[PDB]
Paper text:
The phospho-MurNAc-pentapeptide moiety from this intermediate is then transferred to the lipid carrier undecaprenyl phosphate (C55P) at the inner face of the cytoplasmic membrane by the essential integral membrane enzyme MraY, generating the penultimate PG precursor, lipid I. The peripheral membrane enzyme MurG then transfers GlcNAc from UDP-GlcNAc to lipid I, forming lipid II, which contains the basic monomeric unit of PG. MraY is a polytopic membrane protein with ten transmembrane helices. The structure of the enzyme from Aquifex aeolicus revealed that it forms a dimer with most of the monomer–monomer contacts made between the N- and C-terminal helices. Our characterization of this and other related MraY variants supports a model in which MraY is feedback inhibited by the accumulation of flipped lipid II, limiting the synthesis of PG precursors when their supply exceeds the synthetic capacity of PG synthases.
The cryogenic electron microscopy (cryo-EM) structure of the YES complex containing wild-type EcMraY was recently reported, and this methodology was used to obtain the structure of EcMraY(T23P) within the same complex. Focused refinement of MraY alone in the EcMraY(T23P) complex substantially improved the potential lipid density at the MraY dimer interface. As in previous A. aeolicus and E. boltae MraY structures, this electron density fills the hydrophobic cavity found at the MraY dimer interface. However, we uniquely observed this electron density extending into the periplasmic space above the MraY molecules where the environment is more hydrophilic. Although structural refinement could not conclusively identify the lipid within the dimer, the size of the electron density extending into the periplasmic space is consistent with a large head-group such as the disaccharide-pentapeptide found on lipid II. Notably, the T23 residue lies near the dimer interface on the extracytoplasmic side of MraY. We conclude that the T23P substitution generates a hyperactive MraY, leading to elevated lipid II production in cells. Consistent with this possibility, tyrosine at position 21 has an altered conformation in the MraY(T23P) structure in which its hydroxyl group forms a hydrogen bond network with Y227 and K358 on the opposing monomer. Substitutions within these residues were also identified in the screen for hyperactive MraY enzymes, and Y227 is in the periplasmic helix that was found to be altered in the MD analysis upon lipid II binding. Although this result may be affected by the enzyme being stuck in an inhibited state by the phage inhibitor, it suggests that T23P and other changes in MraY may affect the conformational response of the enzyme to lipid II binding rather than the binding event itself.
Numbering used by the authors:
A (entry chain E): 1 to 58, 64 to 121, 129 to 360
B (entry chain A): 1 to 56, 64 to 125, 129 to 360
The structure:
Amino acid sequence: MLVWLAEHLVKYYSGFNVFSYLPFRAIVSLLTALFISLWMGPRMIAHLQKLSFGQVVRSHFSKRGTPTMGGIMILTAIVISVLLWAYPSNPYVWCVLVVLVGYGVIGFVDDYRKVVIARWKYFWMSVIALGVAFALYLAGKDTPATQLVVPFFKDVMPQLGLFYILLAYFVIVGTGNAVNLTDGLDGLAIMPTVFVAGGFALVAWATGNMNFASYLHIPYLRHAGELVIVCTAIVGAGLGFLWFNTYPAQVFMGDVGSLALGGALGIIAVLLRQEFLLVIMGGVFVVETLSVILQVGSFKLRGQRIFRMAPIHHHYELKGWPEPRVIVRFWIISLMLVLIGLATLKVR
Amino acid sequence: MLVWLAEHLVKYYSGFNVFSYLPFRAIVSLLTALFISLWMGPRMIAHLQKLSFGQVSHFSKRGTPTMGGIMILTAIVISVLLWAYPSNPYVWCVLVVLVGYGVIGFVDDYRKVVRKDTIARWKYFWMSVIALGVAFALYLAGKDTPATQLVVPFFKDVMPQLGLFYILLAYFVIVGTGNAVNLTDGLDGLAIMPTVFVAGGFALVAWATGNMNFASYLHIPYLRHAGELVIVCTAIVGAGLGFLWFNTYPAQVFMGDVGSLALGGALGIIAVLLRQEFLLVIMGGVFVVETLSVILQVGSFKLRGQRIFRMAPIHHHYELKGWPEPRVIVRFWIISLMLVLIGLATLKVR
C-alpha cells in the first residue's frame, strides 16, 4: 500500500516515480523484510522465552530451553513487507498472503496447544488449499495460466481441468509437510527456503515481461510480475530469521513459521505453473519426504530399517556427522538444485 | 579445451553447438569443478593428514590439515582449462595470478607446517612483482581504451581514464584483496562462502559486460573476450562450494595461505579485468571491514595503547565476546550475501 502513496504523491515531486520500478521495489522489499525481522528480534525471543519458561535469563552447543514460536517473526516480516511494497490490487499477492496467514495460524495454534491434533491440522490445510485452487481455477478458464509446464519440453503443455486443482492441492500440502519435517534441525528449513524463494523471484520476473516470457516459453501471467516482491520479501525474511536460527539456534523455527513458509513456496510454485521447478529447486524437502516414506514403508514391510532415522538429516546426524556440518552440506545441496532448476527453464 | 574438441568434431557430432553457448558451458563448468572437488576431497585430506602429522573428540582442534587449498586451486584450474577458451588473454591472466598466489601460499605453508618453522616478506615481494607484471601487461593491452577507464557507480557521467595510475590501482586492489582474504580465514568456512557469493556476482557482471547491447543498457565498459571470465568466476563458485563441503564448522580440512591467497588474488584480478574495483569493495565489504578493523585496532594499540576490540579480526572479536563459531560464520555469510545483492543493485542505478 505504501507504493500507492508514492504514485499518488508523485505529482508534487516527480522523483517518486522510481518506486514503481520492479527491481528497486524488490530490493527495498528485501531490505525492509530483513530490517523488520532484526528489529523484532531479541525483544521477540525474550517475550517468547518469558512466556514459555518464565526465567528470561539464559552450554551453547548443548542448547536447552530455547523458544519454539519464532515463526511469527517470519510471518510479520513477510506480511509487512508485502503489504508495504506490493500492489494490494493484485489478486495473486493476496492469494499468497492468505495462504501464508492460514498456514501460519494453523501452526501457531498447533504450537500453542503443544506448549499448553493431526486430523485438525490436515483438514484445515486441505480445505484452505482446495479453496485457493478452486478460486485460481475459476479465474484461469482455458488459459495458459492453468497449463501444466514440464522442463525439457515446449511442444507439450497439457491443459488441466480438475487435475489443476488436484495438483495444486498436492503441491501445496506436500511442500508444507516437507518443510514441517525438514524443521528437524535448526536452520535447515530456512536457507533452502531462501534459495528457492530467490529462484522463484527470478522465475516470476521472467514471467512478467513479454519479451522474456516469449523467449523462455514460460506461460504468461499478467499479474505474476508482482510476485517478485513477495518472493524477495520471503528471501529477506528468511535471511533475517536465519540470523538467529543458526546451529546455536537462539529461537527454534517451530511449525508456526515452517508451515507458512512451505505453503508460501508451494503457492508461488502453483501460481507460476512451476510445480516441477519447485520439486527440482526444493529437492531437499522432496528427498526428505521420500526418505521418511521409505523408512516407514520398510519398517512396516519388514523388520530391517533403511536409515537410522526417517529423515535424512537425522540419519546423518546420528551417523556421526555434527549438526552444523550436515546443515551446511544440505545448504550446498539446496543451492546446487536451485541453480539446476533455473537452468532447466533455459534448456527448454 | 573441450570446446575446441566440440568445434572440430561437430562435423559428425551434429548438434554440439550447445557446447559453445555461454550459459550452458558456465553451468557445466560449475558442475565439473564441484564434482571434481567432491571426488578428490577425501584423498587429499587423507594424504595431508598422513603428511602434516605423519599419522591418520567431536570438535577437536587438532588433526585438521592446514594447507588444503590445493583442492580449490586444482579444481579451478582444471575446470577453466577444460571449459574456457585458452585463446583469450583474460582467462590466462586470471589463471596465472591464481596459480602464482597458490604456489606462494603453498610454499609458505610447507615452510610453516612441514618444517615446523614460524617465507618472510619474500611472499610480499613475489605478490608485488606478479601484480605489477600483470598490471603492466594489461596496460600494454589497453592504450587509451575503455578497458582502463575507471568505473564509478551511481554516476555514469564521470569515468576518469587512468594512465600510470592503472598499475597502482591494480596493485592496491589485488594485494589488498589477497591480504584481506588471508586475514578473514581465521575461522573455518568464513573465507569461502563469501568468496562464492562475490564470484557469482562477478560472473553475472562479466556476462553483462560481454554483450554490446546489455553493456550499453547498463552503461558498463564493453570488454571484448571478457565473457569467458564468466567461466572462471563460475568455476570459482563451484570450487569454493565444493571446498565448503569439507570446510564447515567441523572443519575436516583447514585452508591455509594456499587457496586463501589464491582466491583473494582471483577476486582482485577479476575485479581489475572487469574494471569494477569499487564494486569489488562493495561485494567484499566483509573482507574490507575485517582488514580495516585489524588496522584500526593496531593503530589504537600503537598510539593510545588501549584496545577497543578483543582481537584484531572482527570475527575473533565477536566469538571471544560470547558468540559461538557457527553463529559468527553464518552471520557473516548473510552479511556477505546481502552486500553482494547491494552491489549488484548498485550496478543498475547510475
